[PDB]
Design a protein around this ligand. Structure first.
Ligand SMILES: Cc1cc(CN2CCC[C@H](c3cc(C(F)F)nc4ncnn34)C2)cc(Cl)n1
Ligand SMILES: Cc1cc(CN2CCC[C@H](c3cc(C(F)F)nc4ncnn34)C2)cc(Cl)n1
Ligand SMILES: [Mg+2]
Ligand SMILES: [Mg+2]
Ligand SMILES: [Zn+2]
Ligand SMILES: [Zn+2]
Lengths: 327, 339
């Protein structure tokens, strides 16, 4: 019901930090964004159905440190930011943008704070079901979304045409699958070539690729805020990662270095992630949309901040307690 | 008053009653409670026969020992337990190295008494700081150099010139002159700048062979022995050396803080924001401490274990240096400390 303007004057700016919104008001902000983008009217969405959907989606997230509902919410908010600041209506069809937003809400449903490889290593039921087709967790997220849509009172696409209903299911599947960084790294050349030749709004394949880039851009958008956010996020990511590393050690396996709390050097790991994964993503975004320049610039500054703060990970002088008893 | 009374009237306790390993290079005198240290000085002086050989008046000796102890302040490192542990090491050298084949009795006595007094009234700051802070001590002594060491010597002389404290009072004019001269040379020898100045003369002495009839060799040897006592904390186990690092750097960083606050850039080892302890200790062991105990081993074969302990302690800093890098997250699971 509520107008975005009342939530905060800065709500539609790239400088806004949606994790600042209390968690009890996030479901209202989802409705407020959908209304502001005018999807509820355009597609005649039943508001009580939408409300029950939004709540079910929220309740469908578990509470690991990073991959929780506040992540889903902030990913979705970034999608709204892209629509508001880049005017995506000029580049994508309306149904594509809508599918992208709903995918953002659902893209990590029922995440257990472990990656795909752990699911397979540990022979989880999710691995038995999905490991043969790849992207184990992402297939699960989509299957959870489907189960939500088919829960009584929650099918927001109840009334759609068969063409639109199907297009929505196909878009959500492909977009949610696109959240696997393995997928992104596989299409990275195709994304570059599209940016060279130039985005062809008449090209159905270019629509598919742009949707993948935009979804990745939403998934990593925490890195486009200030230092304070990036610092908190690293805190959350690494607690989640180290917890999986601990589980892998109890299994008699050697975790990859980034999940091993005894070997992980956070500044190196973060700088490499920022330089080799996050930056190229927002560089591609900047090439496609000149108005996305500031996003790339924040990611690069956040990366430069990590170098500037790296020295603090070596103890100089004595510890605060004037003892070397930590040795 | 009551501390004196017991020192004088209870009798000097046998050195073996201090600890079964008291006369061993492995013993750590810092484990002796501070309240037992003045009696331990008396037992060491007795065991070395100095009390009887020099007919030292016991009331005077008791007063002198307490006055010396009272003349140390309590910075983290340069305090009475330093002077006590340094004196203990001198005792160790006497017991283990047969100094009597190298030095005169009066020279050994002078070394011990110098060890007791060699840091008197230290204020936890070095020579450079006295100059930079325009201290009273720099006003007195900076034109001659070794400012703190001249102060330590002057303090020791002032104790001896305190009524009832002159343990040498009955010495002949010549013997008294000799003792005070020895104390001056020995205490001045504790300025590491002096040590570094005479280091090549120490090497030449060690190469050609110690000549007991060479007066300059006696002088050189007294300097090296004093320096050896002064750094002797580094010849014990890893646990001692780690604690000693805590004390040194607390003292150094306090100075560096004062230096910043008066507009000067402290040395890296004094600067708690630049100092990397493992690397500083490795350098100190390699450039300062190991060469000293190597010289001592070259002169005294039974000193080998001292060098080997210093070399081992240098190796431990290499082994432990990785733990100064934070792997994973801190125990509180926060990165608060980055802001
Ligand atoms: C090469 C690589 C890949 C990954 C994959 N990881 C998957 C889960 C989310 C995670 C992530 C997400 C975000 C997000 F907030 F932008 N920031 C992140 N900063 C470091 N990791 N990280 C990325 C992590 C790292 Cl540290 N390094
Ligand atoms: C090259 C050098 C010289 C110095 C000079 N310093 C004078 C005051 C006593 C000090 C000292 C004395 C002792 C002692 F225990 F042997 N251990 C020490 N470990 C580090 N410093 N240090 C030596 C200190 C350092 Cl860290 N490095
Ligand atoms: Mg995911
Ligand atoms: Mg001194
Ligand atoms: Zn995600
Ligand atoms: Zn000293």
């Amino acid at each position: 019901i509520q107008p975005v303007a009342a939530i905060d004057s800065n709500f539609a700016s790239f400088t806004y930090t949606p994790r600042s919104l209390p968690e009890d008001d996030t479901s209202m902000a989802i409705l407020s964004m959908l209304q502001d983008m005018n999807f509820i009217n355009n597609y005649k969405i039943d508001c009580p159905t939408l409300a029950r959907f939004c709540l079910m989606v929220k309740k469908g997230y578990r509470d690991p440190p990073y991959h929780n509902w506040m992540h889903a919410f902030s990913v979705s908010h970034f999608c709204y930011l892209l629509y508001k600041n880049l005017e995506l209506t000029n580049y994508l069809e309306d149904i594509e943008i809508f599918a992208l937003f709903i995918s953002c809400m659902c893209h990590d449903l029922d995440h257990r704070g472990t990656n795909n490889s752990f699911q397979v290593a540990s022979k989880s039921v999710l691995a038995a079901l999905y490991s043969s087709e790849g992207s184990v967790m992402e297939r699960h997220h989509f299957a959870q979304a489907i189960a939500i849509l088919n829960t009584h009172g929650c099918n927001i696409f109840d009334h759609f045409s068969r063409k639109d209903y199907q297009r929505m299911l196909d878009l959500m599947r492909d977009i949610i699958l696109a959240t696997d960084l393995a997928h992104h790294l596989r299409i990275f050349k195709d994304l570059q070539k599209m940016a060279e030749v130039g985005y062809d709004r008449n090209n159905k394949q270019h629509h598919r690729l742009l949707l993948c880039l935009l979804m990745t851009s939403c998934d990593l958008s925490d890195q486009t805020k200030g230092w304070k956010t990036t610092r908190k996020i690293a805190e959350l990511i690494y607690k989640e990662f180290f917890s999986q590393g601990d589980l892998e050690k109890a299994m008699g396996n050697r975790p990859m270095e980034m999940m091993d709390r005894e070997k992980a050097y956070i500044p190196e790991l973060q700088i490499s992630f920022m330089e080799h994964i996050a930056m190229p993503i927002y560089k591609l975004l900047q090439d496609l949309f000149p108005k996305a320049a500031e996003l790339y610039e924040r990611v690069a500054s956040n990366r430069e901040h990590w170098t500037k703060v790296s020295h603090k990970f070596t103890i100089r002088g004595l510890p605060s307690n004037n003892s070397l008893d930590f040795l």
